[PDB]
Design a protein around this ligand. Sequence first.
Ligand SMILES: CCCN1CC[C@@H](COc2ccc([C@@H]3c4ccc(O)cc4CC4(CC4)N3C(=O)c3ccccc3)cc2)C1
Ligand SMILES: CCCN1CC[C@@H](COc2ccc([C@@H]3c4ccc(O)cc4CC4(CC4)N3C(=O)c3ccccc3)cc2)C1
Lengths: 206, 228
Amino acid sequence: SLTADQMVSALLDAEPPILYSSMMGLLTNLADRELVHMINWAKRVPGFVDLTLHDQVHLLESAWLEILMIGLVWRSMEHPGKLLFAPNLLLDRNQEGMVEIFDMLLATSSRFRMMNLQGEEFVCLKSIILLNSGVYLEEKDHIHRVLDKITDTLIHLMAKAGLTLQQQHQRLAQLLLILSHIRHMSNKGMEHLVPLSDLLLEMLDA
Amino acid sequence: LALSLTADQMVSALLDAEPPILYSEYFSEASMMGLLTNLADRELVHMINWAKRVPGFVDLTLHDQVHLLESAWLEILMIGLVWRSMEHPGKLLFAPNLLLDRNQGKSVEGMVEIFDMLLATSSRFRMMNLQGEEFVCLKSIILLNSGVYTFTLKSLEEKDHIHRVLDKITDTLIHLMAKAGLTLQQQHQRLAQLLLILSHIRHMSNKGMEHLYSLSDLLLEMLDAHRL
Ligand SMILES: CCCN1CC[C@@H](COc2ccc([C@@H]3c4ccc(O)cc4CC4(CC4)N3C(=O)c3ccccc3)cc2)C1
Ligand SMILES: CCCN1CC[C@@H](COc2ccc([C@@H]3c4ccc(O)cc4CC4(CC4)N3C(=O)c3ccccc3)cc2)C1
């Protein structure tokens, strides 16, 4: 029922912290710690907790890598040619099979700068990834009504910046089309790298 | 020219550029994959002729036309297949004479997973009553979008052109929806629903590439036509 402004506010307040840091051992350990904070960020995505724990775990399981990636890209925009994994972990391109995904993450940062992605826009993109990455009946309806509620919020945000309706649906399309690339990097990321379901449930206890 | 097209003129060109539906040869579990590979192989030739007719596409360099098609060709086959199958619940219409069900897919190692994912996309389009004009817009977006992030001054010019053309197709999708009577919220919501499905088609494409591995040269040579 929330308004677009209240939607934004709740998402902005739910942002997880930036965490701090043998390269792959460091990156795995950092990703494990971020995942915990992702779970509690997910709880605060409005509409998410209305789902069953089984649906909650299905979405998180299908989207966690995409979420770590778009968050990496978001904090790496002001660091051209480099990924800011952690504030004490800034790697560039020279830092088997890694450089292709690293090249893809950089081009994602480059695209975010080209579009001048806004923070408000970013937290809507993350929520869309959470609810959409796994949607493929009452549950789906709800997921799609909330995805619809987030669409309404992205348009409001753009209208508030003074964009014409033409520029609004154009920018919305451009933002949602980046999600395919992020899905693509996640797929390629999964290849390059007890069930995660059971760990995801356990994290949902705190 | 492509950027001066109206929405209707964009729909019209996309519809006219549509490739024909092909058939399989005039069956068993053992020959299934040879038939599907023959089909894809012939469809690809026609896919090239279709892409050359998507407004703005031939304004690109050859090398960039190849890149876009290497990146999108499987997604385009799949979205074509899903569209053909929309009106056959539980079934994929690879060709009018090659309609397969989940069980026939179970026959191959790893196939049913892709097959269940393709079948759900088809039911999702069905639930949305996807129109033909929106379909040809979605397939064009896949063509121009799928590789635009895996590419010089010249390359910057190229990507800017692609995103301008992708904007015109977005104006065209919205024009269709307003033409279909939709309110301005529903227009934005349906546009988003359609473009999020493309994420799932990408997902299917990559899982599909792993199954097919479990072409650059060819594309240039269908694209790099002489003028004789
Ligand atoms: C048993 C518990 C299971 N966990 C869950 C899966 C299992 C390892 O998952 C992991 C392991 C490492 C990562 C990092 C990481 C960390 C933090 C970040 O913000 C972002 C990223 C980005 C990422 C995803 C591409 N990555 C890389 O290194 C990288 C590789 C190639 C090119 C560029 C970057 C992410 C997830 C351990
Ligand atoms: C030099 C070129 C080399 N060729 C070009 C690539 C190389 C074969 O690639 C191929 C081979 C087969 C296909 C079919 C096919 C055919 C027609 C169609 O319209 C759509 C599809 C969809 C598709 C992609 C999922 N598929 C399957 O069977 C299938 C698998 C798992 C579950 C369900 C279906 C598509 C591409 C040989």
